[PDB]
Design a protein around this ligand. Structure first.
Ligand SMILES: [Ca+2]
Ligand SMILES: [Ca+2]
Ligand SMILES: [Ca+2]
Length: 223
DNA sequence: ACGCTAGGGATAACAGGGTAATAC
DNA sequence: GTATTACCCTGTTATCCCTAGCGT
């Protein structure tokens, strides 16, 4: 049995690396469920071959969250996060962190739920059949935000920024969320694009569901 | 008086492409 | 040389986040 330690620095097309990879078969329950929320939120699952293998690429401003996701996918992530320092078209420095897993057939199970012709889509029962409290918690740390950011406000309404999805797609998600978690949420608009509004009346319900998984440095997103 | 929104800004994300390091 | 592929890099906005001033 080869250990990550032994291959995390060898060339990409390295034999020992591939041997290490062959030792891995599937993603554990945690990596799968969290992945459903990550793909619905800020992650990117792609294939460079023709759907034979997929890998996941990450990028966030918050490094702690980044480190937390890498640890989650430890076995599939050979390197530490990498600082990316870029300059705007406004001459400003923008700092973020990047990371990725290597490609592996283990990721095909996640990818085939969303990808179709290398194009991302949300299927009609994704929520009902795969979205768990853990998935939802990650989807929240990703796309999640407050409805009212004003100070001293008591509004407990949550928002999921799903601006890249179609209205049909957002409808599948909303149906699943309402039926499965009794959440009182629905579609609203932002920059002419669909977002999911969760009424403050469902806050406590929403919170108890994702509480077990949000990390401390992400708590600031809650009301 | 003040809880709430819709309008909108400079990112903080997503998508793909290019290549240095192994194999044969 | 050609085939592989993890780790960067670059092209680009739909993102989360804010707040002027609207509604009651
Ligand atoms: Ca997102
Ligand atoms: Ca995010
Ligand atoms: Ca985006």
């Amino acid at each position: 049995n080869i250990k990550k330690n032994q291959v995390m620095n060898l060339g990409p097309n390295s034999k020992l690396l591939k041997e290490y990879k062959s030792q891995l078969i599937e993603l554990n329950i945690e990596q799968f469920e969290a992945g459903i929320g990550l793909i619905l939120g800020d992650a990117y699952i792609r294939s460079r071959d023709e759907g034979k293998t997929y890998c996941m690429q990450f990028e966030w401003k918050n490094k702690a969250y980044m480190d937390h996701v890498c640890l989650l996918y430890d076995q599939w992530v050979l390197s530490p996060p990498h600082k990316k320092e870029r300059v705007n078209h406004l001459g400003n420095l923008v700092i973020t962190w990047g990371a990725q897993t290597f490609k592996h057939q283990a990721f095909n199970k996640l990818a085939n739920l969303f990808i179709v012709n290398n194009k991302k889509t949300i299927p009609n029962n994704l929520v009902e059949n795969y979205l768990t409290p853990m998935s939802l918690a990650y989807w929240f740390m990703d796309d999640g935000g407050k409805w009212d950011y004003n100070k001293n406000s008591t509004n407990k309404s949550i928002v999921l920024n799903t601006q890249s999805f179609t209205f049909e797609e957002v409808e599948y998600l909303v149906k699943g969320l309402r039926n499965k978690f009794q959440l009182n949420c629905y579609v609203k608009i932002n920059k002419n694009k669909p977002i999911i509004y969760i009424d403050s009346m469902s806050y406590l319900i929403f919170y108890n569901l994702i509480k077990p998984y949000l990390i401390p440095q992400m708590m600031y997103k809650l009301p």
